[PDB]
Write a protein that binds this DNA or RNA. Sequence first.
RNA 1: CAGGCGGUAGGGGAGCGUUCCCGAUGCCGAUGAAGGCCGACCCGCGAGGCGGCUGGAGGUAAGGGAAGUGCGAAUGCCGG
RNA 2: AGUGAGGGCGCGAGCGAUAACGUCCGCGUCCGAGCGCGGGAACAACCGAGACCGCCAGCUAAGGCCCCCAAGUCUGGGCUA
RNA 3: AGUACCGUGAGGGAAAGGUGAAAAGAACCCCGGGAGGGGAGUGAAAUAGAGCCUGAAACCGUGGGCUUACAAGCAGUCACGGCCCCGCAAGGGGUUGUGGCGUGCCUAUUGAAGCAUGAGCCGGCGACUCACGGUCGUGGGCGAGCUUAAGCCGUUGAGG
Lengths: 139, 49, 110, 117, 156, 101, 57
Amino acid sequence: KTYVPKQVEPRWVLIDAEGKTLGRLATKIATLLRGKHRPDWTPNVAMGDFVVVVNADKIRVTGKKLEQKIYTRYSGYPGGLKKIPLEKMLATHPERVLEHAVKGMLPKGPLGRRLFKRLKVYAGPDHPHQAQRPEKLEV
Amino acid sequence: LRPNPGANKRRKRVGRGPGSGHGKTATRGHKGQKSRSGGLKDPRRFEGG
Amino acid sequence: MEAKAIARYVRISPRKVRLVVDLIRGKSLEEARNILRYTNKRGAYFVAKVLESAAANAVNNHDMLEDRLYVKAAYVDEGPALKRVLPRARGRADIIKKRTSHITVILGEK
Amino acid sequence: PRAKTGVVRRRKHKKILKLAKGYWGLRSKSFRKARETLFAAGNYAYAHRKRRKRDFRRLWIVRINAACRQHGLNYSTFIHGLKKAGIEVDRKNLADLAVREPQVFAELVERAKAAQG
Amino acid sequence: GEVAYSGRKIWPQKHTGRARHGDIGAPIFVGGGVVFGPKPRDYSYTLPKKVRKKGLAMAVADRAREGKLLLVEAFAGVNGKTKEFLAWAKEAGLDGSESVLLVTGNELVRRAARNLPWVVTLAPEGLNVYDIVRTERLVMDLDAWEVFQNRIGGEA
Amino acid sequence: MFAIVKTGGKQYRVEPGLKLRVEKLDAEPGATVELPVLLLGGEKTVVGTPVVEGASVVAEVLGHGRGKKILVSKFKAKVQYRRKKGHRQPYTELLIKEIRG
Amino acid sequence: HPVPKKKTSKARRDARRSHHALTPPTLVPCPECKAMKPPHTVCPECGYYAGRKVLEV
RNA sequence: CAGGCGGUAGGGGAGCGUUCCCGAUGCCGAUGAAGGCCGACCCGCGAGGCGGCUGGAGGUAAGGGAAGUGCGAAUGCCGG
RNA sequence: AGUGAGGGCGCGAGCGAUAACGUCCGCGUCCGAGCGCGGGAACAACCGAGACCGCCAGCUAAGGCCCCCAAGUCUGGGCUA
RNA sequence: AGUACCGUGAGGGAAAGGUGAAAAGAACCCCGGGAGGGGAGUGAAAUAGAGCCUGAAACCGUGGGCUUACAAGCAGUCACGGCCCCGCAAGGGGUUGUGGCGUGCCUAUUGAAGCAUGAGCCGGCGACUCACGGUCGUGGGCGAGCUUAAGCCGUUGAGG
């Protein structure tokens, strides 16, 4: 039957990251940024949780390390599709490696979009989370 | 002022065009307009003689 | 209705004429006047005059606080066109139809 | 003799005028392609009322999963639960209740976990 | 309507004016000739005298059995002028809500038997199934003649 | 109150309202007629419990009338493939006015 | 040789005609009499800043 | 109860308006003919009534008969 | 009354180089002409399946259940890394 | 209209029907060079005003409602949420942002999204008939059944 979505229901949450492992932690973080889990869960949003994770870096590698290259081919074509390996990957942009997992499953242009918006982390150690002064739910 | 043709009499098959929705009437080009084609009988005439 | 500023069969032109009124409406005779008058390009007087009758119809048989007559609602209309034909190599018929313009602009009181 | 079908078609067509709601500029008054665009819309609503079923299928699917699991165990589990479940096993509401009567779900649950065993 | 003024040709059915067509003032367009022509004609219809009269008969029969005025006799009109004829009517009981086929050689009968309503002016041993069943009631004079004619129909 | 019994496919979860549902045109042969739906999903304002027993205990009933009918909407059968024909949505039930219990 | 394909609707036509658009004429009052004067100019009345040398006849 | 019901070519059935012929003009009508402009009652549809606005005079069927007829569509035909 | 030429897949012979989304014939299915749904990413003919019309109903094919997206990141025993 | 107009000639060969019931069809005043524009009178109407009846589609225009600058789609459209609308509520309207799923129609194709094609937009025209022969059906008269050419009566012209 019916059952229409509430109203401005805001919830954030702090994720460890560190120590946890690559992909799987992603699957999680992932669906986590639901839109389906708390009532009136669906198209127009719902949870997804304004979720933020730290120690984003210090993640455990799927035992692969090297042999996993992200790309950035803005490329003025016949340029470079810039191949890069997880190592340096993180070295400068770890929060991002995870990122690629994240987007990895995050879908829908405008929507998913907005979700990455409510999806933030910092391979910073945590202090970043601190910067995100607000509530600090957790797992 | 009433006695409409009894049973069926009145126009029975002056079916117009080819089909309510659609329409076209027959085969392929071989029977176009100026197409009153190989009339009565081709090989049948062979018989004839 | 109010101060009617409109007229028929004068072969000026659509778009352009529309531009003029575009800029002149809003304000009143005072301002839109100054613009219609000292701003360059055709239409100038066609427009201005249409203004004039508008205003006359106005303080004449509508009257209203003359001074505050300001163009209220307005813009233009083009009727038929002269269908002229020119030459364009290996003969061929090159056609054109100049716009015989009519203006639908009204002066409103406020 | 005569036959100015006019009367007729002017009509058939305005009919069409309406047929055409006020679609995307041009496929709007688009007589022809208007009509077309319509045939489209037609087969469309087709597909539409057709599958809205599965649409809900999912709808609830998740709403509920949401709750059953939120609680203790997903579909294989919970579902199977209402399954073993006796003179009581309904669906087009599991959601509903999960929602409306928090208790309602909490226990439909309780028993259900047991329902399985 | 071509033959004579068939406009021989005008479009360079060549291959550039993009357009097809060799003949102007051609069927398929602008007020020219039209498809399966409205040919002057006529509907003959030699419908077997057999049942033809058989019926004229049958119609006469029912129409009459419901309302039959086989006059053989009648007289009210200076030999048969309108006004007086009318009186007659009132006599023969013929009023508004009634249309009758006056049929027979009593030419004074036809003579006064005009008037759009009530009466239809048929002074001839000229009959017909239609006029028959269509005319409320049959009213006719030289019925010696008639009934006998119908009989002639009956056995040739 | 909001109780659940359901019919012909789960037409239920309600209270006293003209909640029109499915065509059980049987007692319909009479205007506001009455009839019961065997519960299953017994639950009303605090007391919440079992659809088994719903399958086997109290029933509810209504006093109903009216119908509804063809609800407009059309559907045209065409395929790009080269064709198209279509018709109107014919649907209804004499509708129910709810009788508690 | 290169005649487009159709016309992205009045829509487009506008897109263009549109960014186009018609602005208005600069003016303040006669440094001398009144009315509208565009920056450096005189006219059929005042006509000056130092010697009308213009208007009336 | 069967029991079936994607389905062009193609074959069969059954309805739809459409302008005329009887219309056995019934009349209807200046408190409008008609075409038009708009509309959440009728039709399984082709169509229907009906309501509201225009619009200046027609129009027409109870039942049946007669057909230059119903059309994207043919680099179509004529005019915008 | 209509096609009087069609293609694909599987098996069986031609042929072709035992090549081709090749072409020859046959048994079957096929796809057109319904073959509009599932589907395998999306794909006329590969496995499932015949749609007269509904349902803010439930059981299933094939084939699926970390996520993007419905469905165990089931359990059990291994073997690669 | 056999005239316009193309062709050397031969020759080809348009378009345009209606103001109103009757002219009472516009004195006169007002912006203006003029047209043309506001008034007065016309009148039953002048959104009946001189190309002037009925006077729709197309296209361009003036105002109002919703809508729109991190957006990738014929179309759409199922859903829903935000607006605004008639609303007694039921709710009915229009409008859409979020999302699900969606290769446009014709022709000729084994085969089409078409990058194969037709397709510029509106409107009116635009194509399985007629005469007989027949031929099979089947609705109707008698089994021997039916009648051309004609002579005759014929507002209706009546059929014989």
